[PDB]
Write a protein that binds this DNA or RNA. Structure first.
Ligand SMILES: NC(=O)c1ccc[n+]([C@@H]2O[C@H](COP(=O)([O-])OP(=O)(O)OC[C@H]3O[C@@H](n4cnc5c(N)ncnc54)[C@H](O)[C@@H]3O)[C@@H](O)[C@H]2O)c1
Ligand SMILES: [K+]
Ligand SMILES: [K+]
Ligand SMILES: [K+]
Ligand SMILES: [Mg+2]
Ligand SMILES: [Mg+2]
Ligand SMILES: [Mg+2]
Lengths: 105, 309, 48, 255, 81, 99, 123
RNA sequence: UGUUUGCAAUUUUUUAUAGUAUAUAUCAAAUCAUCUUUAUGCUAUUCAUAGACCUUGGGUACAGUAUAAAAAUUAUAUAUGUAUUAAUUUACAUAUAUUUUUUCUAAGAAAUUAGGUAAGAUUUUGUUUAUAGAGAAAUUAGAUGUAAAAAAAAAAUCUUAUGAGGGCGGAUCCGCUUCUAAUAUUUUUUUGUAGUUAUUAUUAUAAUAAUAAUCAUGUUUAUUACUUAAAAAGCUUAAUGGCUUAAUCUUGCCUUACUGUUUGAUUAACAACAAAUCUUA
C-alpha cells in the first residue's frame, strides 16, 4: 500500500506542479540537451521517469489511476527506469549511439 | 449478538477482492472511445470559493485535505531515509542516553508562577501589577526532559538570503530567488530592509532578500543533502559552532556563496546564472527540542560535527 | 491652493448638487448620491 | 432508464459502463486501501465481542466483591458500554458506501453510524445558526436560563421553508406549521411542542407578557421520523392538543 | 473575506543517489538528473570517519604540484614512511 | 442513450427559455406603459404638472438603483465559452481533414 | 539579459495565473480518494501506535532496572543506591563528543554498498 | 451537452409527476475560467517500386505493464526549391515577418490611501539568544504555561427569578415572607477517578490488584479553549487619555462624508447671549 500510495501522489503532483523547463537546466544544441530530447521522446514527453506515461493536461487527464496488479508502481520498475535513463545516449559529437554500443550503468 | 446487529448490514469493506476476469474487461480508455460522446455533467457542481467569508456564510470552504480544495498539496512521495533512521535507531539511544529515573510514587511537580505577585502585609501589595519576568526581558521556555513521550525531532527549516547590493542591481535578487528555489523546491517570498544606513547604502522598505520554509519530509530530505553531500565538500570545514542556539531548540548557521553552489541542484545548472550572483544563505533548523543542549544532542544523532568556538 | 472645492451636479437635471473638496492633481469626482427632489439615488457628476 | 434511477449522468453512465459494484473497481490504490480498512473493521468487531463478554463477567459479580461497592461496578460497566458504542461507529465510519447512502438520504437512522454523521452535519452549519438566534434575539435568558439545542427543528408554513427568525406575514402564519424534526439519540421518546409569543405588550402595567399559541404533548418520536404536521396531532398523530393553533399577530405600533 | 492562497511548487523528480560507498537511496529533487554519483561524501570524509585508517595517510594534493614534481623528476624525493 | 438524454435536456431548456421569453415580453410591456404614463396633478395656482417624486419612480419602484444589477450570468459565459472553443478545435479538424 | 530572462520565465510559469487549477473529481473518483486518504491516515495510526508502544516498552525496562538498582547494596561495602546514583550521572552526555559521529553519520539506505560490513577493522 | 467522464454527494429557486402536506426528477442562479478534435498527425514494421542504401504509393499494428492510435494539433504573407495539375492548381520541404493555442520578461518582486459595512488575524514595537559576508550600527529564525473520557451526591452561607401567577398585610403595585430552581462562594462531608495500550505481581490466554502513558478516526506544520507583567508599536498630525474581547492590521463589496424635521442633555456648553458639542425619534 505504501508503494501504491506514493505512485498515486506522484501523479497528482503531475497535475498540480508547474511544468518542467528544460531551458533552465540544459542549453540548446548540447550533448545534454540532445540526450534529454531522445530519452524524453521514449517516455512520450513525460519528463519524470517513475510515473509511467501520464499526460496531466488533455482530454484523458482523468485516467490517472492505475489498475490493480500493476508493475509500474513497484520499486523494482522504478529503479530499472532511473538506471536506463542514466546511460549516455548521445556521443560527444551529437549522434545517437548504436543500440548495441550503449554501455549500461 | 445484538450489538453486531446495529452495524451496517451491507459492508463494502467486507466484500471479496475484484475478479480477474472483471479486471481484464475493465478498460477505462475503451469506454471514452466506444462512447463517441460526452457523458452529461453531474448536477453537483460545488467548487471551493476563492475567499473565506465567515463561518456562517452559506458557501463554506473545505479543508486542505480535500483534493478539490485550492490549498491541497499531494501527499508523501517517499520516506526520507533520515526520518526512518532517527525513528529506527536513534529514537531509543537518545531516550536511553538521557534518562532520569523517577521513583514510582513521586509527587507531581507543581509549576510556580513566572510572573510573580507581591505578598505581604503592606496594603499596597494587594492591587500591585504582577512583577516583571525575572532575569531576561522575555520568559524563556522551560526545558522538558527527554522522555518516551517527548523525542526531539526536526520540524521545519528556514533558508533566507539577504542581498543589499540588489537594490542597485535588480538582477541580484532574481538570481537569489532562483537559487533558493531549486535548493528547496518551493517559491521563496521576497523580504525587505527595515533600517536606514547611509554608510552601507541601505534604504528602508525595499526588497533585499528572500526566504523559504520547508516542512515535514522536505526538511528531512534537505538535512540529508546538507549533511552528507554539501558540508563534506566545504573546503577546510570545522563544523557548526558550539555557540549556535537561541535557547529554544533551534540551530542556526550560514553558508558561503561558494558553498551554496555545491548543492547538487545548483551545480548542475551553475552555468545558467550570471557570474558572481549566487548568494549565501542563512539556514535555521527548527526542532521540537526545548533547549540548546537538546538540539545539539539531536543534531549529533543525525551526523552533524560541532566544534568549540 | 493644493485643495479645491468642486461641485457635483445631479444628472437628473433637477438642479440639486453636492460640494466636496479634493486635490487639484486628482481625477474628477463622480458618485452615486441621493437626490431629494426626485427622492431617489442618481448619478452625480462634477460640474466642470 | 426512467427518472427513478437518478440523475441523467447516472442513467447515461449506467448504460454505457459495466455492471460492477463500486467496491470492486479494479484500481490499485483503491483496493490496497480497502484491505487496510477491511482487516481493521475485523479487529474492531473482535473487540466488541471481547468487551461484550467482559460485561457479563462483571454483571454476574456480587457488588461486595468490588472494593468500591455497587457504585464502582456501575461506573465500570458505564465506561464499557460507552467504549462499545465508539467501536460500532469506527467499524463503518471508513466505509465508502455508508457515506454514499447517507449523502443520498437513504441512510438507516435506526443505526448509530448514520445518526453520528447526521449530528455532525447538523452541528456544522445548522446548529451554528440556531445557536446564534438564541443569543441575538435574547431567547436566553428571557425564556430559559441556559439552552443548548440537541435536535434539529425546521418549520415550514404551507410547504415553504422558513429561515430561523424570518419576519412572516400574518396570512402565511395563519395555519399550523409543519415541523421537520430530526433526533440523533437512540430509541423512542415522547415529545412536547410549545409555541410561545414572548413580546405581548401589556400597556396596563407597562411591560410584556408571554402568550401560548400552541401546546401539544405525548407525541411519540423516533430517529426515523422526520415530518410532524401540527395541524393533525389528535387524529393522525398520537397526542393531546392542550391548545390549538392560535394565529400569531402583532398590533400596530408595537415592535 | 480571507483569500485562500494556492501553493506554487515547481516540477520535482525522483533521483537515485549513489554515495561513494556504492550504496544507493532514492530522494525527491528538482533537478532532472536521474542518477547522482557522489565521489566525495560523508562516507569518504575524515571528519565523519575519524577511525578509518584508509582515509588518513592520504596525499590530498589538491593543487596538483606534488604530482607535477613527481612527473618531471620522479619519486626519488618523497616522504618515505 | 446519450443522444436521446441530451435531447430531453434541450427540451427542458427550451421550455424554460420559451417561458422566460414569454414572460420577458410581458415585463417589457408593463415597463413601457409605466414609463409612458404622465400623471398631471393640480398642484397650485390652478397649474397642472407631474410631480418630481413620481418622475423618479418611472424607471422602477424604490428599494434598488436601476442599472446596478449584474447584466448576465457567469454560467452562460462558461457555457458560451465552451461552445466557442468546441468550434475552434472542431474547425481545425475539418481543415486538417480537408487537406 | 538573456540568462536573466530565462530565470524570469521560470517564475512566470509559477505565477497563480499559470499554475494548474484545483482538481475536479466526480463522485466515484472522489470516494475513491476518500478511502485512500482514510486508509493512509489509519496506516499512520497503526505505525504511530506501534512506534510509541516500543518506546514505552523500552522505557519501562529502564524504570524496572533502575528501580531495582536503587534498592541494591553493593558491590561489597557500598551503601544502597550507589550504582544507581552513579548511573544517573550525565557526564559528557550533552557535550560535543557525546555520540560518535561514525555511528550517527551512517544512515539507512535502500541498498548496501560494495562492502556492506568491514570485518577486518583493527583497533 | 460548461464543469472530468463509473453511477442520486453543496445552497436557493423554477417547472412537472406521483401524492395529501411530503418524495423524486428537472430548470435557473450562486460557489469555480479544467485544459476536452476519439484521430485527420507521429512512431514502428511490412509489401511493392523505376533505384545505385534510397525514390514513389499502399498496407499492417488491436492497446491495463494501456497504445503507433496525440506532451499540446492556428491562420497566413512572402522568396527559394521539389513534385504536381486547365491553371504560383495542389501537396511537401526549407528558411523569415506575423499573428493564433490566454501557453514562459517574477506584481503572489512595486505603490506607506485613511470613510461605511462584513468577515478574518490579535504584542504588532523595543529588548534579548543565535545566525555566510556582517563591524557599535543591515537580514532571518526564535523567546509563558495549563487543559481537552466522564462525573454523581448531602447540607449550609448569601444573591437573584416575568418560578410555584405561593402565603399574609395592605396574578402582575408594595415592605415583610416559606418552597423549588439557577449563578457564585467553602479547603467544604464525601463517593467515584474508569476504559484502552503497556509493565510488574499473584492466580487458572484469562481474571484481580498496583504503577506509568493516554485531547486525537485526524493531511503534525495538528487543532481548539484558556493564560502570557508593564512600557512600546499602530490608530491623519503635538500632548494626555483610550482601544488589543476593537477604535489597529488584512481582504471583499461599497460611497449614510445621505435629504427634511425633531427629542433629551452638556448638573441650563464657554460662571451671559450668539457661532458651538454630544444624542433620540
Ligand atoms: N498525527 C496525528 O494525528 C497524531 C495522533 C496522535 C498523536 N500524535 C502525536 O504527534 C506525534 C507525531 O504525529 P505522527 O506520529 O502521526 O506523525 P507522522 O510521523 O506519522 O507524520 C510525519 C510527516 O511525514 C508523513 N509521513 C508519515 N508516515 C509516512 C511514511 N510511512 N512515509 C512517508 N511519509 C510519511 C506525514 O504525512 C507527515 O507529514 C506523535 O508521535 C504523537 O505524539 C499525532
Ligand atoms: K505514523
Ligand atoms: K474596507
Ligand atoms: K506583553
Ligand atoms: Mg481608522
Ligand atoms: Mg519582534
Ligand atoms: Mg451657562
Amino acid at each position: 500500500f505504501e508503494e501504491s500510495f506514493y505512485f498515486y501522489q506522484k501523479r497528482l503532483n503531475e497535475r498540480l506542479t508547474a511544468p518542467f523547463r528544460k531551458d533552465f537546466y540544459f542549453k540548446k544544441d548540447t550533448a545534454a540537451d540532445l540526450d534529454w530530447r531522445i530519452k524524453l521522446k521514449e517516455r512520450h514527453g513525460v519528463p519524470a521517469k517513475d510515473i509511467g506515461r501520464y499526460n496531466p493536461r488533455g482530454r484523458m487527464a482523468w485516467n490517472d489511476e492505475v489498475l490493480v496488479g500493476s508493475q509500474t508502481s513497484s520499486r523494482k520498475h522504478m529503479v530499472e527506469k532511473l538506471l536506463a535513463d542514466a546511460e549516455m545516449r548521445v556521443s560527444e559529437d551529437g549522434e545517437e549511439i548504436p543500440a548495441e554500443d550503449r554501455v549500461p550503468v | 449478538i445484538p450489538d453486531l446487529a446495529e452495524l451496517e448490514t451491507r459492508s463494502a469493506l467486507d466484500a471479496p477482492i475484484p475478479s480477474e476476469e472483471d479486471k481484464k474487461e475493465f478498460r477505462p480508455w475503451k469506454r471514452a472511445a466506444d462512447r463517441k460522446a460526452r457523458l452529461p455533467s453531474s448536477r453537483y457542481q460545488y467548487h471551493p470559493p476563492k475567499y473565506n467569508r465567515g463561518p456562517l456564510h452559506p458557501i463554506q470552504s473545505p479543508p486542505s485535505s480535500d483534493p478539490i480544495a485550492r490549498d491541497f498539496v499531494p501527499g508523501p512521495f517517499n520516506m526520507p531515509r533520515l526520518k526512518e533512521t532517527f525513528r529506527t535507531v536513534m529514537a531509543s539511544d537518545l531516550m536511553t542516553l538521557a534518562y532520569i529515573h523517577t521513583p514510582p510514587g513521586t509527587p507531581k511537580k507543581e509549576p510556580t508562577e513566572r510572573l510573580r505577585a507581591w505578598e505581604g502585609d503592606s496594603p499596597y501589595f494587594a492591587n500591585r501589577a504582577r512583577r516583571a519576568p525575572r532575569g531576561a526581558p522575555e520568559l524563556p521556555i522551560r526545558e522538558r526532559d527527554i522522555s518516551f513521550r517527548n523525542i526531539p525531532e526536526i520540524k521545519e527549516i528556514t533558508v533566507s538570503t539577504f542581498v543589499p547590493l540588489g537594490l542597485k542591481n535588480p538582477d541580484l535578487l532574481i538570481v537569489a530567488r532562483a537559487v533558493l528555489l531549486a535548493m528547496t523546491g518551493t517559491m521563496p517570498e521576497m523580504t525587505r530592509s527595515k533600517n536606514n544606513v547611509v554608510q552601507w547604502q541601505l534604504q528602508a522598505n525595499k526588497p533585499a532578500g528572500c526566504k523559504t520554509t520547508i516542512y515535514g519530509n522536505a526538511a528531512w530530505e534537505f538535512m540529508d543533502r546538507l549533511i552528507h553531500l554539501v558540508l563534506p565538500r566545504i573546503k577546510d570545514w570545522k563544523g557548526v559552532p558550539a555557540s549556535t542556539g537561541d535557547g529554544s531548540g533551534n540551530v542556526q548557521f550560514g553558508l558561503n556563496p561558494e558553498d551554496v553552489q555545491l548543492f547538487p541542484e545548483v551545480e548542475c545548472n551553475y552555468d545558467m546564472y550570471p557570474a558572481k550572483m549566487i548568494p549565501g544563505c542563512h539556514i535555521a533548523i527548527k526542532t521540537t527540542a526545548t533547549s540548546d543542549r537538546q538540539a545539539k544532542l539531536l543534531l549529533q544523532s543525525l551526523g552533524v560535527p560541532f566544534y568549540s568556538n | 491652493s493644493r485643495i479645491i472645492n468642486v461641485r457635483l451636479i445631479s444628472m437628473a437635471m433637477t438642479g440639486y448638487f453636492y460640494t466636496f473638496t479634493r486635490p487639484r492633481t486628482s481625477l474628477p469626482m463622480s458618485m452615486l448620491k441621493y437626490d431629494p427632489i426626485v427622492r431617489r439615488k442618481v448619478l452625480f457628476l462634477e460640474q466642470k | 432508464g426512467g427518472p427513478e434511477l437518478g440523475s441523467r449522468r447516472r442513467r447515461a453512465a449506467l448504460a454505457t459502463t459495466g455492471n460492477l459494484p463500486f467496491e470492486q473497481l479494479p484500481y490499485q490504490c483503491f483496493q490496497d486501501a480497502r484491505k487496510i480498512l477491511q482487516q481493521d473493521r475485523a479487529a474492531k468487531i473482535a473487540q466488541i465481542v471481547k468487551e461484550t463478554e467482559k460485561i457479563k463477567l462483571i454483571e454476574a459479580r456480587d457488588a461486595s466483591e468490588f472494593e468500591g461497592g455497587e457504585a464502582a461496578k456501575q461506573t465500570r460497566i458505564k465506561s464499557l458500554r460507552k467504549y462499545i458504542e465508539e467501536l460500532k461507529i469506527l467499524a463503518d465510519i471508513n466505509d465508502p458506501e455508508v457515506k454514499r447512502r447517507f449523502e443520498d438520504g437513504r441512510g438507516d437512522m435506526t443505526k448509530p453510524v448514520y445518526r453520528f454523521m447526521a449530528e455532525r452535519r447538523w452541528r456544522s452549519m445548522d446548529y451554528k445558526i440556531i445557536a446564534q438566534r438564541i443569543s441575538q434575539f435574547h431567547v436566553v435568558p428571557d425564556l430559559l436560563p441556559a439552552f443548548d439545542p440537541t435536535m434539529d427543528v425546521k418549520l415550514s408554513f404551507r410547504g415553504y421553508q422558513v429561515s430561523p427568525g424570518a419576519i412572516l406575514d400574518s396570512r402565511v402564519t395563519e395555519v399550523a406549521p409543519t415541523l421537520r424534526m430530526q433526533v440523533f439519540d437512540k430509541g423512542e421518546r415522547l415529545l412536547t411542542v410549545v409555541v410561545i409569543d414572548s413580546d405581548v405588550p401589556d400597556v396596563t402595567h407597562d411591560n410584556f407578557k408571554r402568550r401560548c399559541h400552541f401546546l401539544a404533548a405525548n407525541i411519540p418520536w423516533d430517529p426515523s421520523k422526520t415530518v410532524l404536521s401540527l395541524r393533525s396531532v389528535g387524529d393522525r398523530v398520537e397526542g393531546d392538543v392542550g391548545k390549538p393553533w392560535l394565529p400569531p399577530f402583532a398590533q400596530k405600533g408595537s415592535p | 473575506a480571507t483569500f485562500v492562497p494556492r501553493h506554487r511548487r515547481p516540477y520535482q523528480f525522483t533521483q537515485l543517489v549513489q554515495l561513494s560507498d556504492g550504496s544507493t537511496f532514492t530522494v525527491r529533487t528538482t533537478m532532472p538528473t536521474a542518477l547522482y554519483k557522489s565521489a566525495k561524501d560523508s562516507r569518504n570524509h575524515l571528519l565523519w570517519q575519524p577511525s578509518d585508517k584508509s582515509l588518513k595517510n592520504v596525499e590530498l594534493d589538491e593543487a596538483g604540484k606534488l604530482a607535477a614534481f613527481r612527473e618531471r623528476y620522479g619519486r626519488g624525493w618523497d616522504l618515505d614512511a | 442513450v446519450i443522444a436521446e438524454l441530451i435531447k430531453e435536456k434541450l427540451a427542458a431548456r427550451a421550455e424554460y427559455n420559451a417561458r422566460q421569453s414569454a414572460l420577458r415580453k410581458l415585463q417589457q410591456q408593463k415597463m413601457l406603459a409605466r414609463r409612458g404614463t404622465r400623471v398631471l396633478r393640480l398642484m397650485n395656482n390652478y397649474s397642472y404638472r407631474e410631480t418630481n417624486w413620481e418622475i423618479g419612480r418611472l424607471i422602477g419602484d424604490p428599494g434598488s438603483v436601476p442599472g446596478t444589477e449584474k447584466v448576465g450570468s457567469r454560467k452562460a459565459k462558461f457555457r458560451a465559452r465552451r461552445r466557442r472553443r468546441n468550434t475552434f478545435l472542431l474547425g481545425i479538424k475539418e481543415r486538417k481533414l480537408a487537406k | 539579459d538573456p540568462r536573466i530572462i530565462n530565470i524570469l520565465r521560470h517564475f512566470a510559469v509559477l505565477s497563480p495565473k499559470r499554475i494548474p487549477p484545483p482538481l475536479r473529481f466526480g463522485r466515484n473518483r472522489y470516494l475513491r480518494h476518500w478511502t485512500i486518504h482514510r486508509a493512509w491516515l489509519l496506516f499512520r495510526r497503526q505505525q504511530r501506535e506501534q512506534r510509541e508502544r516500543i518506546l514505552m516498552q523500552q522505557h519501562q525496562s529502564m524504570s524496572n532496572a533502575c528501580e531495582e538498582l536503587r534498592n541494591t547494596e553493593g558491590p561489597g561495602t557500598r551503601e544502597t543506591g550507589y550504582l544507581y546514583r552513579v548511573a544517573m550521572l550525565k557526564n559528557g552526555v550533552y557535550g560535543l563528543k557525546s555520540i560518535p559521529i561514525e555511528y550517527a553519520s551512517r544512515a539507512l539506505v535502500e541498498t548496501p554498498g560494495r562492502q556492506a560490513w568491514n570485518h577486518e577493522w583493527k583497533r
